[PDB]
Design a protein around this ligand. Structure first.
Ligand SMILES: COc1cc([C@@H](CC(=O)O)c2ccc(C)c(CN3CCOc4ccccc4S3(=O)=O)c2)cc2nnn(C)c12
Ligand SMILES: [Cl-]
Length: 290
């Protein structure tokens, strides 16, 4: 059975509870069980075929509540189940999975911009802090390559960042890597082949269409073809060797545009529209439901 791209949550006028799944094999969207609590600025990931929604904030007519929540969606049952909450609320979070564990990276709680990082063990339903990043980062992009965790760009409370760093699990240690050529907060960050991609983002002045990638072997960042749309706070994932970017904000519109990147041709193509424009979604890929 094929795999779908799931988008959870996001923001349009207020934080959203939508869970919808796109099937690249046939172009279809399915609306699935809503999140129990609306949330924007969350991240999605998958472990053991389960979809997890991590952190965010409920920006609603009746207030703004940063989320420490971890919730688990089972495609086999179409149900959300609460898991243990994180140590702290983390809005505009990034996450990465290594060796079946979820790393929650940075994000904000009110005016607190976190450098802290914590790790979730599904088999124990427990979170534990690990070493903090060298830098406070909200709107941080996170990717995993070769069982190493990367935190890329973001906003430290004062400046948006071109900096990036790498976490070495067996040393419980963060070290800076080569900075990007572009300042990016709320970029989409993912991995494809031996490269970390950083797509779009916000630099304090503009939403960006540029895309660059870090080759871990050469330790250098290189720009590739820009996206068709400028976008910050986009969702990003990889499905069958291609990068998909979903939604985001372009300084004018909350985008419904979904674009995909073919690395072999260095081209971006429009592939579908989300059912409604939105930014700050969580995105991941897993099996079709039921
Ligand atoms: C301060 O303005 C901005 C901040 C960010 C950054 C944070 C920063 O650099 O200060 C950012 C990064 C990541 C995420 C998820 C967000 C929040 N989302 C985008 C903004 O839209 C809203 C608005 C209200 C609630 C939630 C959202 S969001 O879609 O979750 C911001 C991105 C922007 N893009 N355009 N503008 C005007 C931006
Ligand atoms: Cl926000």
């Amino acid at each position: 059975v094929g795999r779908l791209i799931y988008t959870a949550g996001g923001y349009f006028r207020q934080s959203l509870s939508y869970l919808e799944a796109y099937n690249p094999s046939n172009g279809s969207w399915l609306r699935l069980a809503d999140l129990q609590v609306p949330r924007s600025g969350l991240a999605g990931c998958v472990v053991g075929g389960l979809l997890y929604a991590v952190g965010g904030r409920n920006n609603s007519p009746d207030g703004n509540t940063d989320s420490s929540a971890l919730d688990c969606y089972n495609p086999m049952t179409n149900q959300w189940s609460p898991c243990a909450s994180m140590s702290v609320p983390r809005n505009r979070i990034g996450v990465g999975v290594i060796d079946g564990h979820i790393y929650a990276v940075g994000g904000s709680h009110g005016c607190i911009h976190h450098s802290s990082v914590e790790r979730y063990e599904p088999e124990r339903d427990e979170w534990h802090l690990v070493a903090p990043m060298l830098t406070r980062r909200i709107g941080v992009g996170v990717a995993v390559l070769n069982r190493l965790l990367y935190a890329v760009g973001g906003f430290d409370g004062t400046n948006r960042l071109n900096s990036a760093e790498c976490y070495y699990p067996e040393r419980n240690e963060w070290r800076m890597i080569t900075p990007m050529n572009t300042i990016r907060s709320g970029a989409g960050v993912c991995v494809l082949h031996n490269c970390i991609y950083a797509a779009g983002g916000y630099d304090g002045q503009d939403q960006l269409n540029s895309v660059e990638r870090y080759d871990v072997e050469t330790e250098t960042w290189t720009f590739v073809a820009p996206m068709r749309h400028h976008r910050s706070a986009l969702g990003i994932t990889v499905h069958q060797g291609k990068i998909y970017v979903l939604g985001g904000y372009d300084g004018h519109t909350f985008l419904d545009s979904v674009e995909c990147y073919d690395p072999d041709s260095d081209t971006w193509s429009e592939v579908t529209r989300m059912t409604s424009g939105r930014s700050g979604v969580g995105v991941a890929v897993t099996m079709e439901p039921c």
